[PDB]
């Protein structure tokens, strides 16, 4: 009971992200931006971590 | 309609300069912007 | 025969390089994301020039 949750994701000194923290939602988090915004970069952050 | 407004406003606001606090390493807070539980996370936009 | 071969290859390579370099100016700075232009680079390979 009481499944653990990912609360936040931090990127430090990355291309386009010097210091950025996203607060992960309990149900759904939706990145949105134009092509080249760097969303794949954020998911890359999550996976590589 | 609130959501469909918020998005649009943000789309219009982020084209106007950047926020200098975003390089401070200090996360911004989730300021409430209405009743019913809507929240926003953004530093003040200073450098136009 | 080997000399004639090498000569004809050199001439064909030069002609094709000129054609492609002339064609490159047929592009007008497309705007895609952070990509601002596309170009074709043609260069004789030194490993093959030797
Ligand atoms: N390894 C890399 N080397 C150089 N530039 C890169 C690299 N990875 C990403 N970029 C650039 O960083 C910017 C963001 O790329 P990315 O693929 O993360 O964007 P995106 O908004 O997630 O993409 P899309 O929405 O099309 O999936 C783009 O300019 C991309 O060219
Ligand atoms: Mg992407």
Automatic annotation (TrEMBL), chain A:
Taxonomically, the superkingdom here is: Bacteria
Chain positions recorded as Mg(2+) 3 binding sites: 40
Q: Report residues binding Mg(2+) 1.
A: 40
- Compartments in which it is found: Cytoplasm, Nucleoid
What residues does ATP bind to?
Answer: 33-41
Tell me the residue numbers annotated for binding Mg(2+) 2. Answer: 40
Family, as annotated: Belongs to the SMC family. MukB subfamily.
- What does the domain comment read? The hinge domain, which separates the large intramolecular coiled coil regions, allows the homodimerization, forming a V-shaped homodimer.
User: What is the protein's quaternary organization?
Assistant: Homodimerization via its hinge domain. Binds to DNA via its C-terminal region. Interacts, and probably forms a ternary complex, with MukE and MukF via its C-terminal region. The complex formation is stimulated by calcium or magnesium. Interacts with tubulin-related protein FtsZ.
> What is the stated purpose of this protein?
Plays a central role in chromosome condensation, segregation and cell cycle progression. Functions as a homodimer, which is essential for chromosome partition. Involved in negative DNA supercoiling in vivo, and by this means organize and compact chromosomes. May achieve or facilitate chromosome segregation by condensation DNA from both sides of a centrally located replisome during cell division.
Identify this protein by name: Chromosome partition protein MukB
Q: Which organism is it from?
A: Photorhabdus thracensis
User: Which taxonomic lineage is given here?
Assistant: Bacteria, Pseudomonadati, Pseudomonadota, Gammaproteobacteria, Enterobacterales
Name the gene behind this protein: mukB
* Included stretch of the parent chain: 2 to 50 of 1482
UniProtKB/TrEMBL annotation, chain B:
Location of this chain's protein in the cell: Cytoplasm, Nucleoid
Note the superkingdom of the native organism.
Answer: Bacteria
State the coiled-coil residue ranges: none
Q: What does this protein do?
A: Involved in chromosome condensation, segregation and cell cycle progression. May participate in facilitating chromosome segregation by condensation DNA from both sides of a centrally located replisome during cell division. Not required for mini-F plasmid partitioning. Probably acts via its interaction with MukB and MukE. Overexpression results in anucleate cells. It has a calcium binding activity.
What does the annotation say about its assembly with partners?
Interacts, and probably forms a ternary complex, with MukE and MukB via its C-terminal region. The complex formation is stimulated by calcium or magnesium. It is required for an interaction between MukE and MukB.
Query: Family per UniProt?
Result: Belongs to the MukF family.
Full protein name: Chromosome partition protein MukF
Q: Which residues of the complete protein appear here? A: 393 to 440 of 440
TrEMBL record, chain C:
State its location(s).
Answer: Cytoplasm, Nucleoid
Subunit arrangement? Homodimerization via its hinge domain. Binds to DNA via its C-terminal region. Interacts, and probably forms a ternary complex, with MukE and MukF via its C-terminal region. The complex formation is stimulated by calcium or magnesium. Interacts with tubulin-related protein FtsZ.
Q: What does this protein do?
A: Plays a central role in chromosome condensation, segregation and cell cycle progression. Functions as a homodimer, which is essential for chromosome partition. Involved in negative DNA supercoiling in vivo, and by this means organize and compact chromosomes. May achieve or facilitate chromosome segregation by condensation DNA from both sides of a centrally located replisome during cell division.
Domain comment (free text): The hinge domain, which separates the large intramolecular coiled coil regions, allows the homodimerization, forming a V-shaped homodimer.
Q: Which family does it belong to?
A: Belongs to the SMC family. MukB subfamily.
Q: What is this protein called?
A: Chromosome partition protein MukB
Species of origin reads: Photorhabdus thracensis
Its lineage opens with:
Bacteria, Pseudomonadati, Pseudomonadota, Gammaproteobacteria, Enterobacterales
Q: Which residues of the full protein are shown?
A: 1236 to 1285 of 1482
């Amino acid at each position: 009971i009481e499944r653990g949750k990912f609360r936040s994701l931090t990127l430090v000194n990355w291309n386009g992200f010097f210091a950025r923290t996203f607060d992960l939602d309990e149900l759904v988090t939706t990145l949105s931006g134009g092509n080249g915004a760097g969303k794949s970069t954020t998911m890359a952050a999550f996976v590589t971590a | 309609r609130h959501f469909d407004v918020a998005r649009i406003l943000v789309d219009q606001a982020v084209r106007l300069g950047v926020a200098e606090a975003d390089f401070s390493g200090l996360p911004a807070e989730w300021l409430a912007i209405n009743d019913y539980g809507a929240k926003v996370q953004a530093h003040v936009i200073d450098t136009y | 025969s080997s000399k004639s071969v090498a000569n004809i290859i050199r001439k064909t390579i030069q002609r094709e390089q000129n054609r492609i370099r002339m064609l490159n100016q047929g592009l007008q700075a497309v705007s895609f994301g952070q990509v601002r232009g596309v170009r074709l680079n043609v260069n004789v390979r030194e490993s093959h020039a030797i």
